[PDB]
């Protein structure tokens, strides 16, 4: 049932590199991102 594959610990670092945070001018305190919360609803 085994196969030849990579390690999951490597998969961790890969996705963390592809993801990056964001910076918006409208970042309220009680609700994080105002534009994001708008379209969700």
């Amino acid at each position: 049932k085994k196969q030849d594959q990579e390690s999951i610990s490597k998969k961790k670092e890969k996705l963390l590199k592809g993801i990056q945070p964001t910076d918006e001018k409208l970042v309220d305190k009680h609700i994080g991102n105002v534009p994001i919360a708008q379209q969700i609803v």
């Binding site: 409208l26 309220d28 105002v34 534009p35 708008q38």
Partner: protein, 48 residues
């Protein structure tokens, strides 16, 4: 009787506008957004 009646001193016609601008700056507006239509009218309904 005149103690009750309004005067132009105590009105709020500018303090509305100051708050609405705080909304537009704070809130995103688009054509799909329900606020965009009414506010741009509201601005004309003071300055006009």
């Amino acid at each position: 009787l005149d103690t009750t009646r309004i005067t132009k001193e105590k009105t709020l016609t500018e303090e509305y506008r100051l708050s609405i601008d705080h909304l537009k700056n704070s809130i995103v507006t688009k054509k799909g957004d329900h606020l965009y239509d009414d506010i741009n009218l509201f601005i004309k309904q003071i300055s006009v």
